[PDB]
Structures are given as C-alpha cells and as structure tokens.
C-alpha cells in the first residue's frame, strides 16, 4: 500500500489485483504503437476488423451477432444503406454485458463510427449512453480489460468525430458528467483523459465557451475530474508540456480571474498549476510563465485583487521556488497588488 | 516398494489414452481424485492429445493457471486431475462444453454438448447408507456424497445431479428394459437395453444386454451404467449410438 | 517466386493465438529464412512480426518444399507472456541469461550446503585463529 511494486521480482508470472491493473491503466490510444488491423483496408474499416474478430473470438454472443450482420457489411454502400440496423444490433449485444464478447463488439462500434463519421452523429447520443451504462455495469464485475476496451472505444469515437464534437464540446462534456463526477476515482480519471484529447484539439474561441460552462458547474467529484482533465491536456511527454498548453492556460486564467466565475474555479487553477509545475521541467514552463505574468499585469483590478493573489501564492509555493525562472517579476507584481484585500492571503 | 508410487511408465499406462510409445519414457500419472487411475483421463492428455489446444506440458500448465478450464462447474488447476466418465469439461473462452463418454472403440471421445445439457451430469449410485445423526446419503461412482436422498434410490440406480447445487433432480431405477451404457470389459462403450439380471449370491451378478441391432451380450453388473429409458436417453449420445 | 500456404488453422483463445501448419514452396532456392517468414506472415495476418513465431521447418526430400508449424499471437504482449523463453531469445524479444555451466553451479551449491548460516562468524573466527 505505502510502497508500490517498484522493484520487480525475477518471476515471469506475477499476481496483480484488479485495483493494481486499474492504477497503471491510462486511456490514450494514440500512445499505443502496435499494428492496427483497421490500418489496412480493402472495403471498409468495419469489414477489416469484423473479419479479424470472427477468426479470433468464439464467444456465444459475438458469433450470434456476426451471423445477423454478416450479410449487410460486405461492401461500404451496404453498410451505409443498412447503418440503422447495424447500430441497433451493436447496441443490443453490448447491452448483454457479456465479458467474453465485449472486446470485438466495442472495437467494431468504434470502427463503425470510423466508416461513416458525419452520419454517425445521429447515433452519437445513443452510443455514449450505452457505453456509460456498460461502464457503470462494469463496476460490479471487476475486469480491468473491460474498462480498457470501453474507454478506448470512447476515445476512438472522439478521434473520428473530433471536428464535430469540438464545435459542441460542452454538449459532449454534458453527457460524461456522471462519469466525470462518479464516486469512483478512476472512472472520472479515465473519462477525463478521453475528454482531454478533445480539449487540446479545441479552438481557443470554442474553448472559452467550454471553460465558462464547466466553471459554471462548479459553483460531487466534479472538482477532481476537471483537475485531471486540464492537467492531462497540458501534459504531453515527460518533463514537457503540450504546445496548446499556453493557450489553454490563458483561457483558463482569464475566466478564473473574471468576476462572474466562482472562487472554486480559481482554486482549480491553483491545483492545475501545481500539477503541471512538477510534471514539466524549467524550460517548458517558460512560455506558460510569461502568459501568467502578462495576464496578471493586464487584468489586475480591485474586484479580482484577491484572486490574482491566490494564484500567485500557488506559484511561489509550487515545488518551493525551483520552477520559477526570474523572480524580480513577482517582486514587481506584488508591488502592484499592494499599490492597488484579504490580510491572511 | 516402501510407499505409494509417483511415476508411471508409458508402456504401463492405460492403452485407451493412445500415448505414443516413442515420445518419451514416462506418462502422466493421474493424481488422486473422483475416478480410479485406470478409468480416468488426466486433463493434460485431454487438452494436448485429444483437443490439441496445447503443444506441450508447459502450455497445458499455462492454460490451467489462467483458470480457463472448469470440471463439473469447478475450476481445476492440476495438470493430472483425473477427469472421468460422465464428467463435464467446460472451456468458456472457446464456448465449448464436453462430456466424457467412451466410443464404440472403447476410448474417451471428444463429444460436444450444449450448455443446457452441460448443466447436469449422471451418477451411478454405488452405495446408500445412514450417516451420523441418522442422515441418509448416497455415494455415486464419482465420489460425490449427497445427503437427504429420495428413499426409493437404491444401489445401481442412476441419479441426475445438478452441477450448480450438487443435488438430485431425478433418478432412474435399475430394471429390465432400461437403457444401459457399458463402462468395462471388452464390450466397453456399447449401448443396449437390459433383458435379465442373473443374480448369484456371494458372487458377481451378470446382466444380459440387447442392442438395437438385436445382438445380445452378457456383462458383469459392475460395468453397467443406467442412462435412461429405451429410445429416450437422458444424455446426448456420441456418434454411432454405441452400436457394434 | 516463393509461395506460403497456411493450413489446419486452429484458433486458440485459451492461449490467445492462431496455430497452423505452414507450407513453403521455394523452387530454385535452397530454403527460406525464418525472419522473412515471420515478416510475411505478420503482413498477412495483419499482426506484428514480434507476435509471429515459426519453427520445425523440414525441407522435403529433393528440395523445392518445406513444412513446419507457425503461431500468430493476438498481441505482442500475449506472445511475450506465453512463448517459450528460448524462442523469445531466437527472435530477440528476450535477452539470453548468462549462467555458469551445470557442474559449476552444482559445486557451488554443495559448497554452500556445507556452510551453516551467513558464515561471517566463521570468517572472523578463522581470521582471529590465523
């Protein structure tokens, strides 16, 4: 408990608890670099994966599912013409929650969306609802493999429908609130990662609408979920940050400092800053630092006098002082605050 | 010897396993379990030499440790677990359910069954007695001790056991005209209806059996297993229907 | 040209793989390297080369044909989990473990058997004695 399995034994096979698998699991399909069957296609992604799964999986449910839909997926026009029946069967069989057949069905659902992206939008609401019920169902029978399949299916859909979902990112977030706010820590954590991919793909203008909505929700566990969402979006690789991180922080910082936003939002930004401060090295934080200082200088006002202080206190404290580049800037800043509050802060 | 043996020579192994004589020097010794050594099929032989799912002993061990194999609804991890007659072997990953029934040749056959049929098994009542506190019980051929049995159940009758609960759902009396499966001797694997039971006090009883093809043969009562009423067996039978 | 055909294909979800008999027809060639066959079965089944293993190739008398066994695992992780260590070493997926010969290890085992406990007390006792 106190110490994780940092030192590995010489054994080739080792027992791993369900919780242990979940902690290591991370939803980011693009990170995986194993060959994907759907990369090679003759007719459509669905058929390519559908043929493969027929030959690997032998479960009772999947075999029955294949028989119904085998005749209607031979050609892409056939899939498009029969899209309605295919989706209903996929949802119907996923509802059975049979672990022996979830993996092919869930994979095909994602690839189904791949074949007809814009036309899958009318199916978008029902697909997410079915996954949410499955994941909520997944809690009672412990299988880390099921969670990986379900969220990877969710991540794939976002990848294929990235353009359309981004335009209405708040709507996609609204569906996943029960997951992001769920009692279990890891369900919110996983759902945050899947939605984080959309966030980093969001235009700045659309992002400002998205951040306003989520902060408006803040005023159970939604606070923790959002913290994972934003920090995951900013973090890209060890000791480094995503290129969009600077744009996200500026959008986040502006909304938090705005008087309309609740104080809880500023606390989130404080928590978001602390996480990225450790994850990133000195160099990757320089662009992020500059936007904070400029925005603080530009938006310093009596109404937001406290809030700029609360964030600034987080900056000086984070990892002690090692991550802050050049400190005259804070001294120049703190002079401005006193020139323009809460004594305790 | 100064104790129980722990090795088995391939030439000494039961013939009906059909083990290659040149593959090695030793054969799997069945561990203690429900079925006797000579009338059992260890899981390693079944998984490797019959289904061919595993190519070597280590692969069979790996399969078992994954807990993919269930015997009579219970997970078994012993490579040499002695599965035997009327045993239900379930592989969920392959969606396969097997019942171990000898063929006309006299060897265990790879007989696939449905889930509904796999939900139960048949047991020959080897003994009926009162236990402690005056609780009646029946001991079957597979070593199952079942308490509170039906009073009508006697020795040599067949009880239908539900695997999930291990209780008696129904039973079939030993009587003339009942359908019978031979589990011993040269007539092993044949199926026929009883005609007469010759009873010799202090000796082995003999049963005359008549096949569908009108042929008759006599077998010791110990090799007899009642499986249902004529033309209406309670278990799916293998190909050939125990003829010849 | 050179042809490969897979026959007797059995899906084995127990070990999470596909096992088959590989027949390679190679007119006007000595024989075909295992690595090429791994690459090409990988391309065929749309799986990683790391997930494909082949063994037991015997050229038919007179040449022109070879027959052996092949395995294609559902994932490279599954192959690393279930494959024999020596086969993993052949394909480079695993590193050969360096160990002393059997005689040396057995002699060391006997010598360690003769000594009881850690032995540092014996060391200090002999150091004092001499």
């Amino acid at each position: 408990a106190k110490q994780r399995q940092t030192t590995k034994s010489s054994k080739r096979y080792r027992y791993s608890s369900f919780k242990a698998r979940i902690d290591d699991l991370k939803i980011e399909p693009a990170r995986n670099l194993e060959k994907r069957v759907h990369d090679y296609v003759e007719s459509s992604h669905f058929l390519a994966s559908f043929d493969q799964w027929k030959e690997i999986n032998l479960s009772a449910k999947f075999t029955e599912f294949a028989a119904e839909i085998e005749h209607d997926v031979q050609t892409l026009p056939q899939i498009l013409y029969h899209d309605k029946k295919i989706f209903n069967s996929l949802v119907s069989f996923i509802n059975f929650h049979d672990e022996f057949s979830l993996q092919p069905l869930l994979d095909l659902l994602a690839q189904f969306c791949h074949d007809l992206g814009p036309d899958f939008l009318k199916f978008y609401e029902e697909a997410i609802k079915t996954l949410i019920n499955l994941l909520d169902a997944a809690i009672e029978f412990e299988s880390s493999n099921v969670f990986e399949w379900g969220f990877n299916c969710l991540a794939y859909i976002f990848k294929y429908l990235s353009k359309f979902l981004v335009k209405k990112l708040v709507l996609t977030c609204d569906l996943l609130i029960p997951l992001l706010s769920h009692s279990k820590e890891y369900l919110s954590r996983f759902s945050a990662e899947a939605l984080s991919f959309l966030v980093r793909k969001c235009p700045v203008s659309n992002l400002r609408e998205f951040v306003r909505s989520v902060f408006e929700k803040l005023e159970t566990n939604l606070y923790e979920g959002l913290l994972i969402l934003f920090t995951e979006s900013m973090t890209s690789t060890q000791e480094t940050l995503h290129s969009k991180a600077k744009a996200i922080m500026s959008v986040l910082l502006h909304e938090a400092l705005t008087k309309s936003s609740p104080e809880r939002s500023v606390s989130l930004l404080s928590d978001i800053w602390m996480n990225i401060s450790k994850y990133a090295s000195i160099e990757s934080l320089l662009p992020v630092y500059e936007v904070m200082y400029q925005d603080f200088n530009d938006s310093l006002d009596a109404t937001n006098i406290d809030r700029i202080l609360k964030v600034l206190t987080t900056i000086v404290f984070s990892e002690s002082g090692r991550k802050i580049p050049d400190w005259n800037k804070i001294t120049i800043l703190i002079e401005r605050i006193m020139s323009q509050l809460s004594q305790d802060k | 010897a100064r104790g129980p043996k722990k090795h088995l020579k391939r030439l000494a192994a039961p013939h009906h396993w059909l083990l290659d004589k040149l593959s090695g020097c030793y054969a799997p010794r069945p561990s203690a379990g429900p079925h006797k050594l000579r009338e059992s099929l260890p899981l390693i032989v079944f998984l490797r030499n019959r289904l061919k799912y595993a190519l070597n002993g280590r692969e069979v061990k790996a399969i078992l440790m994954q807990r993919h194999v269930k015997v009579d609804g219970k997970v078994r991890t012993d490579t040499t677990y002695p599965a035997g007659f009327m045993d239900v072997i379930t592989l969920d990953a392959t969606n396969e359910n097997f019942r171990l029934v000898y063929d006309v040749k006299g060897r265990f056959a790879v007989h696939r069954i449905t889930d509904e049929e796999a939900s139960y098994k048949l047991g020959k009542v080897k003994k009926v007695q009162l236990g402690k506190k005056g609780v009646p019980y029946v001991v079957t051929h597979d070593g199952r001790t079942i308490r509170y049995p039906d009073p009508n159940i006697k020795v040599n009758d067949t009880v239908k056991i539900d695997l999930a609960s291990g209780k008696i759902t129904d039973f079939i009396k030993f009587d003339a005209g009942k359908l019978v499966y031979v589990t011993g001797g040269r007539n092993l694997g044949r199926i026929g209806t009883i005609v007469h039971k010759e009873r010799h006090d202090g000796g082995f009883d003999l049963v005359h059996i008549k096949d569908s093809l009108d042929n008759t043969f006599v077998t010791r009562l110990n090799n007899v297993f009642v499986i249902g009423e004529q033309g209406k067996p309670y278990i799916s039978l293998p190909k050939g229907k125990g003829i010849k | 040209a050179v042809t490969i055909r897979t026959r007797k294909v059995i899906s084995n979800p127990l070990l999470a793989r596909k096992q088959f008999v590989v027949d390679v027809l190679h007119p006007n060639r000595a024989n075909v390297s295992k690595d090429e066959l791994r690459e090409k079965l990988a391309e065929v089944y749309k799986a990683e080369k790391d997930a494909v293993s082949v063994f037991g190739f015997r050229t038919q008398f007179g040449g022109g044909k070879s027959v052996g066994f092949g395995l294609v695992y559902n994932s490279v992780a599954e192959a690393k989990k279930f494959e024999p260590t020596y086969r993993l070493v052949r394909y480079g997926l695993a590193e050969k473990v360096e160990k002393a010969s059997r005689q040396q290890r057995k002699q060391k085992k006997n010598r360690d058997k003769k000594i009881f406990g850690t032995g540092k007390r014996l060391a200090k006792k002999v150091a004092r004695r001499n």
Binding site: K54, E55, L58, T63 | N97, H111, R112, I113, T114, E116, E117, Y234, I235, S236, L237, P238 | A1, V2, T3, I4, R5, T6, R7, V9, I10, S11, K18, F20, K40, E43, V44
Partner: peptide, 19 residues
C-alpha cells in the same frame, strides 16, 4: 436430447507470393 451442433471452422487457409 440432441448434442450441440458442430461449428464450421472459424479460420481458413490463406496465401501470397513474393520475389
């Protein structure tokens, strides 16, 4: 009761050529 129906093989042979 009837026995379970045999399942047609899921996998089939496959071929290529090179060089």
């Amino acid at each position: 009761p009837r026995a379970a129906k045999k399942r047609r093989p899921a996998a089939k042979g496959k071929n290529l050529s090179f060089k």
